[PDB]
Structure 1
Amino acid sequence: VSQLTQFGSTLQNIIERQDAEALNALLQNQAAELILTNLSIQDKTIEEL
């Protein structure tokens, strides 16, 4: 049983790291997609000048 509890603690640590890394990967996709509109705005500011 104490061996099982040890597998359960390793498993919980894996659970936490998996989803912290899925959020970490998600944020970079959101940042990459948010950048394109800023590029369009800056280019069109040039046309304003």
Structure 2
Amino acid sequence: TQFGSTLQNIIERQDAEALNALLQNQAAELILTNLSIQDKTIEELDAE
């Protein structure tokens, strides 16, 4: 039963880590999109 609860904690952590990895990966995707937006924002000011 102790190996059991130990394994259970390992699994829950294994998944929690996968989640943080997923979230940081996603954050990068949004930053890149936002950079394209800022570039267009500058072009707009140049057009002004």
Tell me the TM-score normalized by structure 1. 0.88
Of 24, 27, 34, which residue of structure 1 is paired with 2:23? 27
Structure 2 residue matching 1:18: 3-state secondary structure: helix
Q: CA deviation at 1:34?
A: 1.0
Q: RMSD in angstroms over aligned alpha carbons?
A: 0.5
How many residue pairs get aligned? The number is 45
Take 1:25 and 1:45, find their aligned partners in 2: how far apart are those partners? 31
Gapped runs of 5+ residues in structure 2? none
Q: CA deviation at 1:33?
A: 1.0
Q: Cα deviations across residues 26-48 of structure 1 (Å, max 9, x unaligned)?
A: 00010011111100000110000
Identity of aligned residues (%): 100
Take 1:12 and 1:37, find their aligned partners in 2: how far apart are those partners? 38
